[PDB]
């Protein structure tokens, strides 16, 4: 049995996305870590053999046989190192992997320069359909969803590009029926 | 590497659904996993070489077979929504603990085909303050109301597909029991945004079912299909 440290993690474009596991047999092996982008399946991204460190790019692993524990940690993480990581361990050649639980990590833009929005947006091809875009909103603001049975937040969306500056953010809303004003009572932090 | 087929798959409760993974690799050994929540994977049965297949940690509604040693099959018998998912191919052999994987097939199973429909993609285009206060220009794409959510969303500039800018939701949301929802965001410079030449599409790819299913409606059938909302730049 094999488990795995956050069930969930969004990080801004520059944390230390830090992964941790846990096997049972304190003599398994080998530790392997899977990376699972969307669209493909687990590739293998990095192994522990034995007892310490191993760097490898902006990656490192620490693994503790007496503690039971490998950790993934990621430095400078990127939009682009988002996926679901898989923890499995081959305690043996001749064993198949006992695999764990998974941990989907997110890398959220990082908003260096807060500068909150309510924007409203209007769908072009008519109707009377808008919604509403918060944007450029502080690391820290977190987002649940809304008052009633006829609205909808989003919360923070997820970056795919390793490379701008202009990697649009925001969370958006949009309600069904014309009256809800586009910057409600929100059920969330809000910050000025 | 490896393949799979389907990508995508719906079934009604009772199905003969087959899964087909195939490694035009040499491996000697094939897998086949599934991933829920909460589950990283778990796996059904395995091949250790064509001929027998053997067992697995969840063989229960499943069955396969290894016709070939580049082709193993698991079949789902009489389906159930149980059994709706992701599932993952693998092929490994001795040479490494490290194994190879197929890229997924996403399986729903429900009780009424019926209710299987390809989502309303809405493109929405920049605020004015946004444009003029933060010389920038975010379009937001939205797609509602489709089932299942076998899809992928992606924007087109100008005929070329993008990435940088473009930021989307991770999972979609349920809407409602069947109806789910996504949405995505496209940040350019409103310089940019007002060339009146430059031309953006939000383009969703749905994965309804196959032409071989029955679809006795009063409406067209929800077949696998991109569906786009389109928007030029504007000057004011």
């Given at each position: 049995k094999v488990q795995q440290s956050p069930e969930s993690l969004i990080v801004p474009e520059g944390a230390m996305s830090s992964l941790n596991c846990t096997f049972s047999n304190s003599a398994s092996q080998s530790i392997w870590w899977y990376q699972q982008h969307p669209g493909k399946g687990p590739e293998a991204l990095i192994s522990i053999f034995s007892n310490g460190n191993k760097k490898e790019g902006r990656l490192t692993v620490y693994l503790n046989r007496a503690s039971l524990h490998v950790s993934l940690h990621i430095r400078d993480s990127q939009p682009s190192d988002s996926a679901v990581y898989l923890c499995a361990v081959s305690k043996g050649s001749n064993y198949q992997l006992i695999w764990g639980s998974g941990t989907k990590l997110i890398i959220k833009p990082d908003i260096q320069n807060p500068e909150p929005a309510v924007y409203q947006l209007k769908d072009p091809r008519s109707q009377d359909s808008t919604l509403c875009l918060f944007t450029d909103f502080d690391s820290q603001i977190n987002v649940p969803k809304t008052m009633e049975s006829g609205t909808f937040i989003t919360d923070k969306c997820v970056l795919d590009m390793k490379a701008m500056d202009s990697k649009s953010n925001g969370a958006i809303a949009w309600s069904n029926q014309t009256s809800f004003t586009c910057q409600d009572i929100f059920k969330e932090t809000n910050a000025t | 590497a490896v393949t799979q087929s389907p990508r995508n798959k719906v079934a009604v409760t009772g199905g003969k659904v087959t899964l087909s993974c195939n490694q035009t690799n040499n491996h000697n050994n094939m897998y086949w996993y599934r991933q829920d929540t909460g589950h990283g994977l778990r796996l059904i049965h395995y091949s250790y070489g064509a001929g027998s297949t053997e067992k697995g940690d969840i063989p229960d509604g499943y069955k396969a077979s290894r016709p070939s040693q580049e082709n193993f099959s698991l079949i789902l018998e009489l389906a159930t929504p149980?059994?709706?998912?992701?599932?993952?191919?693998?092929?490994?052999?001795?040479?490494?603990?490290?194994?190879?994987?197929?890229?997924?097939?996403?399986?729903?199973?429900?009780?009424?085909?019926?209710?299987?429909?390809?989502?309303?993609?809405?493109?929405?285009?920049?605020?004015?303050?946004?444009?003029?206060?933060?010389?920038?220009?975010?379009?937001?794409?939205?797609?509602?109301?489709?089932?299942?959510?076998?899809?992928?969303?992606?924007?087109?500039?100008?005929?070329?597909?993008?990435?940088?800018?473009?930021?989307?939701?991770?999972?979609?949301?349920?809407?409602?029991?069947?109806?789910?929802?996504?949405?995505?965001?496209?940040?350019?410079?409103?310089?940019?945004?007002?060339?009146?030449?430059?031309?953006?599409?939000?383009?969703?790819?749905?994965?309804?079912?196959?032409?071989?299913?029955?679809?006795?409606?009063?409406?067209?059938?929800?077949?696998?299909?991109?569906?786009?909302?389109?928007?030029?730049?504007?000057?004011?």
């Amino acid at each position: 049995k094999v488990q795995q440290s956050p069930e969930s993690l969004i990080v801004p474009e520059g944390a230390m996305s830090s992964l941790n596991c846990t096997f049972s047999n304190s003599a398994s092996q080998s530790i392997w870590w899977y990376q699972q982008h969307p669209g493909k399946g687990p590739e293998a991204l990095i192994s522990i053999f034995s007892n310490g460190n191993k760097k490898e790019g902006r990656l490192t692993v620490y693994l503790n046989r007496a503690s039971l524990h490998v950790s993934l940690h990621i430095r400078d993480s990127q939009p682009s190192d988002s996926a679901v990581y898989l923890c499995a361990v081959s305690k043996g050649s001749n064993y198949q992997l006992i695999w764990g639980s998974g941990t989907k990590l997110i890398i959220k833009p990082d908003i260096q320069n807060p500068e909150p929005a309510v924007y409203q947006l209007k769908d072009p091809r008519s109707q009377d359909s808008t919604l509403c875009l918060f944007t450029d909103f502080d690391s820290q603001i977190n987002v649940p969803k809304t008052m009633e049975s006829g609205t909808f937040i989003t919360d923070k969306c997820v970056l795919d590009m390793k490379a701008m500056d202009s990697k649009s953010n925001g969370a958006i809303a949009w309600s069904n029926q014309t009256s809800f004003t586009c910057q409600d009572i929100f059920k969330e932090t809000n910050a000025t | 590497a490896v393949t799979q087929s389907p990508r995508n798959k719906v079934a009604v409760t009772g199905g003969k659904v087959t899964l087909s993974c195939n490694q035009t690799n040499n491996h000697n050994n094939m897998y086949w996993y599934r991933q829920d929540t909460g589950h990283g994977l778990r796996l059904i049965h395995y091949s250790y070489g064509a001929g027998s297949t053997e067992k697995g940690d969840i063989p229960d509604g499943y069955k396969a077979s290894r016709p070939s040693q580049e082709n193993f099959s698991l079949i789902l018998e009489l389906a159930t929504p149980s059994q709706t998912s992701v599932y993952f191919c693998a092929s490994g052999d001795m040479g490494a603990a490290e194994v190879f994987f197929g890229k997924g097939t996403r399986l729903t199973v429900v009780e009424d085909l019926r209710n299987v429909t390809p989502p309303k993609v809405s493109l929405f285009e920049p605020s004015k303050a946004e444009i003029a206060n933060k010389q920038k220009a975010t379009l937001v794409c939205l797609a509602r109301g489709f089932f299942p959510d076998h899809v992928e969303l992606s924007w087109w500039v100008n005929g070329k597909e993008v990435h940088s800018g473009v930021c989307t939701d991770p999972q979609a949301y349920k809407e409602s029991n069947y109806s789910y929802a996504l949405s995505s965001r496209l940040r350019v410079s409103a310089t940019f945004w007002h060339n009146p030449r430059n031309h953006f599409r939000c383009q969703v790819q749905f994965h309804g079912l196959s032409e071989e299913d029955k679809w006795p409606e009063g409406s067209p059938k929800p077949v696998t299909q991109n569906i786009s909302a389109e928007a030029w730049g504007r000057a004011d």
